[PDB]
Amino acid sequence: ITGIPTGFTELDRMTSGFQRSDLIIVAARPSVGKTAFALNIAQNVATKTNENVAIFSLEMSAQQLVMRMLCAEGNINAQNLRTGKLTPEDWGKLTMAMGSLSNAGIYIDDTPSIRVSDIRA
Amino acid sequence: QDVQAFLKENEEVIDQKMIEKSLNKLYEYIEQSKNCSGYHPKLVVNGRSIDIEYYECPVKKQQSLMKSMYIQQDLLGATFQQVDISDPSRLAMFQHVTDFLKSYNETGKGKGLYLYGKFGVGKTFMLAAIANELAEKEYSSMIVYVPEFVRELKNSLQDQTLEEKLNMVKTTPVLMLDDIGAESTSWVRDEVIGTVLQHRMSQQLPTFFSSNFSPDELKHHFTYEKEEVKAARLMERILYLAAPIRLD
Amino acid sequence: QDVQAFLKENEEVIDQKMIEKSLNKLYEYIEQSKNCSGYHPKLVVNGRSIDIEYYECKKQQSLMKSMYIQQDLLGATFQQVDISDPSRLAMFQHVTDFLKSYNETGKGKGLYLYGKFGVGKTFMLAAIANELAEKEYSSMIVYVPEFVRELKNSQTLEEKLNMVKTTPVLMLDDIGAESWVRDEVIGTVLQHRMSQQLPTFFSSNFSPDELKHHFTYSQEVKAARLMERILYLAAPIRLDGENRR
């Protein structure tokens, strides 16, 4: 870190930050790890390390990814979520997974396959 | 001859139709032997469901040993010479009684039984049979009544109140659990009467386990993905303290 | 300082280069909170790399744990127990003689408590549970029947096969109880530490000539991959003494 927090002590030391002036890129094998990759870099660099993120979703839109991310800063998603309702003691660390992403500035684009025009507008 | 009487007795309460919904029940009812004369089965309406409660037989040195809570002492009295065996598999039990006391000491371990049927197939005379002989000696098989036990074992796990009557479902050399499936917070599954299954195969004990119905099909009952390949393993957590036998 | 402790703990397993490779880990280990205000960090050797696992938080209980049994009847120890016959004439000789030869990585051979109930399989490990207790090491009393019932049937999974393998003193209960499917739980435990080495612990009711009528058939020459790791870590020993049930 030199340096704005990248997210990990494994990732801040090597990247020295973060810095101002950087166009990064990340690619994986067939769904083998490129999405949640960023869904947890800038989000933990939006709820843990300072940066009001204008995020922009693609094939998987935002009114779907919140069912796939409320379970990071509140310990959930193995009880299970894609099965239904939860128990009144499991109604626990959701209200702090509901207090660590709500008092914050995360500003996404739900719009899928639109070119750079509308976005850089 | 009894259903007619009950029907008109509570016909103001007993909503109609349903016959086709409870078809399986009514058909299983007529298909089995059924019948009976320490207690007798009677129907009771509890909310939106009809249950089966036992009332002591109006016809009313082991009961200082044979004292069971949440059920009465008029209806605990059946032996093994009190024997007029009519139906099958009530016969296939003449080596699961006499040889279910000769090596059921203190921490003896293995496999008891899983009694079932419907809602009154001479179950309270076999959970009153096999056991007596164990306690005829200084051996083990505690009687307990779950559908009555739990009714406040949600709201009595408190200030020593029942707190102190409720660690002995874990430590008596043996203990039985009755007609669960009657009602049911889901904590009692793993806090009150699901705390009977881990502390009894960790030190291992020769405990009896009964029910209204059977372990191989009690694996898919309560779904009023989750408890299907997840409701089976409590009938598995059950399956190891005992070895199942028929009650036709 | 933590690195020093871990190094000598698993010396037999760890190599000098392993230390420099896992430097970051061992340094991060010592730099963080060694104590806690619910778990504590401990070093574990996983293959060629050393990791940091968290174990749940006189001194005799806190530095002692147990996996899948009740802590009611484990109040056992060495020395003072009324010794019976050749059942215990040579039982408190290899758990007190070696309270400083449980060597971290310098082959400190183990025991195998078999035989018959109420006398010896798990209380001779409850004996260490309150004896190897004052010095500050944990000693987890793992129970077998209670493990593979949530592990014969399937919350997370590949998690508790490693803090069962990253702490200096252990105690297993009942081997052979209840090719096969009891695969990634107990079978692997025996193969590993020919290149790591510490004090190994297993126990049952069945001796080395009886452990194998229950770990289930395959019909083969495909099951003795873990049984020349008992014949070279103790002796064919049982226990026939006094009932404590």
Side-chain angles (χ1 to χ4, degrees):
Chain A
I1 341 172
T2 52
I4 271 170
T6 11
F8 310 115
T9 319
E10 67 173 301
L11 196 73
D12 228 353
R13 289 189 181 193
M14 200 204 79
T15 52
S16 287
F18 283 152
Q19 93 126 350
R20 290 162 264 90
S21 295
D22 195 356
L23 173 67
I24 316 144
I25 187 153
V26 156
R29 306 297 296 119
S31 294
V32 191
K34 56 201 152 296
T35 325
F37 204 107
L39 305 179
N40 299 130
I41 305 166
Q43 191 264 105
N44 269 184
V45 194
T47 61
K48 289 173 178 169
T49 136
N50 189 50
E51 228 91 54
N52 286 32
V53 285
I55 309 182
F56 302 92
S57 58
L58 259 140
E59 192 220 37
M60 55 170 79
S61 45
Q63 192 112 32
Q64 172 217 303
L65 210 142
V66 179
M67 285 207 292
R68 274 133 199 83
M69 86 149 193
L70 270 159
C71 306
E73 227 147 323
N75 301 323
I76 346 157
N77 211 260
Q79 252 96 338
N80 203 13
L81 250 83
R82 253 167 282 179
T83 189
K85 174 94 170 186
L86 283 153
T87 43
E89 292 177 350
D90 271 309
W91 265 94
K93 211 184 172 185
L94 182 57
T95 187
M96 262 298 102
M98 281 160 70
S100 59
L101 213 106
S102 186
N103 276 249
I106 297 163
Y107 308 121
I108 321 163
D109 178 62
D110 29 292
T111 331
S113 44
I114 50 154
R115 58 189 64 88
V116 212
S117 67
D118 345 73
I119 303 159
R120 214 177 296 196
Chain B
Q1 241 48 240
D2 195 275
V3 175
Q4 307 298 330
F6 175 73
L7 252 301
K8 59 182 62 193
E9 197 68 274
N10 284 271
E11 61 174 270
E12 181 270 306
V13 188
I14 304 182
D15 201 58
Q16 89 168 306
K17 279 69 227 220
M18 107 203 257
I19 296 298
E20 300 188 285
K21 284 300 183 65
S22 310
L23 234 179
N24 307 328
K25 290 289 169 287
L26 273 61
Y27 176 77
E28 183 172 79
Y29 179 76
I30 63 179
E31 129 84 12
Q32 299 180 92
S33 6
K34 183 190 183 69
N35 207 14
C36 45
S37 241
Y39 63 89
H40 292 205
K42 66 177 295 98
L43 296 174
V44 293
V45 56
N46 291 325
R48 287 66 183 193
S49 47
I50 307 170
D51 285 285
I52 305 164
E53 291 287 73
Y54 296 138
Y55 64 91
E56 56 164 64
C57 187
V59 181
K60 184 185 193 301
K61 289 180 187 178
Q62 286 81 21
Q63 268 205 62
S64 62
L65 284 128
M66 324 312 292
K67 265 195 184 191
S68 70
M69 298 257 282
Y70 297 88
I71 208 159
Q72 291 187 318
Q73 290 179 64
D74 289 345
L75 62 80
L76 279 182
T79 44
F80 334 82
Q81 284 153 332
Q82 271 200 323
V83 141
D84 336 304
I85 332 151
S86 39
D87 274 307
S89 54
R90 299 175 188 176
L91 290 150
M93 289 283 283
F94 261 74
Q95 291 205 338
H96 290 269
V97 184
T98 59
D99 298 12
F100 268 40
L101 344 142
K102 290 178 182 184
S103 63
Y104 273 176
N105 314 340
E106 315 145 0
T107 76
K109 306 149 190 178
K111 278 193 154 200
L113 328 150
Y114 304 110
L115 292 193
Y116 50 81
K118 183 178 179 180
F119 310 101
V121 199
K123 302 179 196 180
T124 38
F125 303 108
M126 300 316 288
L127 294 160
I130 319 152
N132 249 48
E133 266 170 339
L134 277 140
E136 271 178 40
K137 317 153 190 195
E138 280 158 296
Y139 300 118
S140 41
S141 40
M142 275 263 287
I143 319 167
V144 144
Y145 193 77
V146 179
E148 262 195 48
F149 254 90
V150 185
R151 272 181 177 170
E152 278 167 43
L153 308 194
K154 291 178 179 178
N155 292 310
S156 70
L157 312 162
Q158 294 146 340
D159 251 356
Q160 287 194 345
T161 58
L162 258 140
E163 277 190 17
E164 296 180 307
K165 274 186 180 175
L166 306 177
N167 247 317
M168 267 268 267
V169 197
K170 308 171 197 173
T171 44
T172 22
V174 176
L175 175 148
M176 317 194 300
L177 297 175
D178 270 335
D179 285 320
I180 336 169
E183 285 194 322
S184 74
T185 56
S186 61
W187 293 128
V188 172
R189 290 181 195 165
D190 317 297
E191 272 203 345
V192 177
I193 262 140
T195 39
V196 194
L197 302 142
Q198 265 200 53
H199 304 317
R200 280 189 155 174
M201 284 303 282
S202 52
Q203 280 190 335
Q204 278 174 295
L205 296 161
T207 60
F208 290 70
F209 270 92
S210 57
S211 34
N212 276 316
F213 300 92
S214 54
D216 252 32
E217 282 196 23
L218 253 152
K219 288 170 171 149
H220 298 291
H221 266 290
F222 289 110
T223 41
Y224 285 129
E225 287 182 291
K226 270 199 178 196
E227 250 88 47
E228 222 212 51
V229 273
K230 264 157 196 175
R233 291 106 216 207
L234 253 149
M235 299 327 293
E236 271 209 15
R237 281 180 179 198
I238 260 149
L239 282 170
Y240 305 118
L241 299 126
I245 292 166
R246 312 196 178 213
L247 267 184
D248 292 342
Chain C
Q1 310 303 329
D2 289 345
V3 175
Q4 307 298 329
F6 175 73
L7 252 301
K8 59 182 62 193
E9 197 68 274
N10 284 271
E11 293 177 350
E12 182 76 6
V13 43
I14 304 173
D15 188 82
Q16 293 175 88
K17 328 183 213 45
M18 187 179 293
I19 296 299
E20 295 302 320
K21 284 300 183 65
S22 310
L23 233 179
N24 307 328
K25 290 289 169 287
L26 273 61
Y27 192 71
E28 183 172 79
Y29 179 76
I30 63 179
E31 129 84 54
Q32 300 180 91
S33 178
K34 234 296 159 175
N35 227 328
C36 90
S37 190
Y39 307 91
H40 292 205
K42 66 177 294 98
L43 296 174
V44 63
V45 56
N46 290 326
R48 287 66 183 193
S49 47
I50 307 170
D51 286 285
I52 305 164
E53 291 287 73
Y54 272 86
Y55 63 91
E56 56 164 64
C57 187
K58 256 208 152 195
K59 271 176 170 178
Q60 283 220 332
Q61 242 206 335
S62 44
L63 328 145
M64 202 286 288
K65 286 142 194 175
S66 43
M67 305 259 277
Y68 280 103
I69 28 158
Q70 269 186 311
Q71 286 180 317
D72 296 322
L73 303 161
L74 289 165
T77 32
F78 311 141
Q79 284 194 342
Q80 278 202 14
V81 172
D82 245 314
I83 300 158
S84 55
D85 298 299
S87 86
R88 275 137 173 166
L89 272 173
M91 273 308 304
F92 300 105
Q93 278 192 57
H94 296 285
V95 231
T96 56
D97 251 2
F98 306 96
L99 289 165
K100 291 180 180 183
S101 189
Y102 283 132
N103 300 299
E104 295 142 357
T105 29
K107 283 145 215 192
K109 269 201 176 194
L111 301 158
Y112 292 96
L113 319 167
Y114 304 129
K116 276 152 187 170
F117 312 95
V119 176
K121 34 156 193 162
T122 74
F123 265 86
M124 273 298 313
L125 302 164
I128 334 172
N130 306 322
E131 265 279 324
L132 260 190
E134 284 155 291
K135 296 172 187 173
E136 278 143 13
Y137 293 139
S138 62
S139 70
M140 31 284 282
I141 326 168
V142 183
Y143 188 73
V144 168
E146 274 269 308
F147 248 73
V148 201
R149 288 162 181 161
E150 302 179 56
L151 260 156
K152 247 192 174 185
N153 311 308
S154 59
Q155 289 183 315
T156 51
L157 283 177
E158 226 219 63
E159 284 192 333
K160 258 183 172 178
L161 308 164
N162 287 297
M163 265 298 282
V164 197
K165 287 157 209 163
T166 189
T167 189
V169 186
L170 313 150
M171 37 271 280
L172 266 148
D173 304 346
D174 296 356
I175 329 154
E178 298 158 17
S179 71
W180 185 237
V181 172
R182 299 173 212 104
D183 298 349
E184 256 196 30
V185 192
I186 309 157
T188 46
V189 188
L190 294 144
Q191 294 182 314
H192 271 292
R193 294 171 171 176
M194 252 273 280
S195 61
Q196 287 171 311
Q197 286 147 164
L198 266 138
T200 53
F201 281 94
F202 270 88
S203 75
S204 335
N205 330 324
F206 330 112
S207 57
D209 253 338
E210 277 195 341
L211 270 186
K212 281 169 146 180
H213 279 267
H214 331 285
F215 245 105
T216 43
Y217 275 114
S218 56
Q219 283 179 318
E220 281 179 33
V221 196
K222 198 195 174 187
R225 285 179 181 177
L226 352 151
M227 277 283 292
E228 279 210 336
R229 277 137 171 165
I230 291 174
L231 310 169
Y232 295 91
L233 272 158
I237 302 162
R238 301 198 201 195
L239 255 139
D240 290 330
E242 287 138 329
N243 220 49
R244 290 151 198 193
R245 300 281 199 183

